[PDB]
């Protein structure tokens, strides 16, 4: 499960990891899939 450029994964104080699509500025609990359009 690769992370295409423009994807970052950040951990919150809760110990949770949220995924941020930097390209569209989206904060989601969805693992970076093989390309997202």
CATH of the domain at 34: 2.20.70.10
- Per-residue buried b or exposed e for 4-24, using 16+ beta carbons within 10 Å of the residue's own CB: eeebeeeeeeeeeeebbbeee
- Number of domains present in the structure of the chain: 1
PDB experimental method:
NMR
Output the CA–CA distances (angstroms, integers) from residue 26 to 2, 5, 17, 22, in the order listed: 17, 14, 14, 7
In whole angstroms, give the CA distance from residue 17 to residue 8. Answer: 10
Tokens of residue 19, six digits: 């995924």
* Residue 27 burial by Cβ neighbours in a 10 Å radius (0-12, 13-18, 19+): exposed
What domain range is 6 assigned to? Answer: 1-37
Report whether 33 contacts 1 (CB < 8 A): yes
What is the sign, positive or negative, of the torsion defined by CA atoms of 9, 3, 21, 34? negative
Distance CA 12, CA 35 (A): 25
């Amino acid at each position: 499960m690769p992370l295409p450029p423009g994807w970052e994964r950040r951990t919150d104080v809760e110990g949770k990891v949220y995924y941020f699509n930097v390209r569209t500025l989206t904060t989601t609990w969805e693992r970076p899939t093989i390309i997202l359009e």
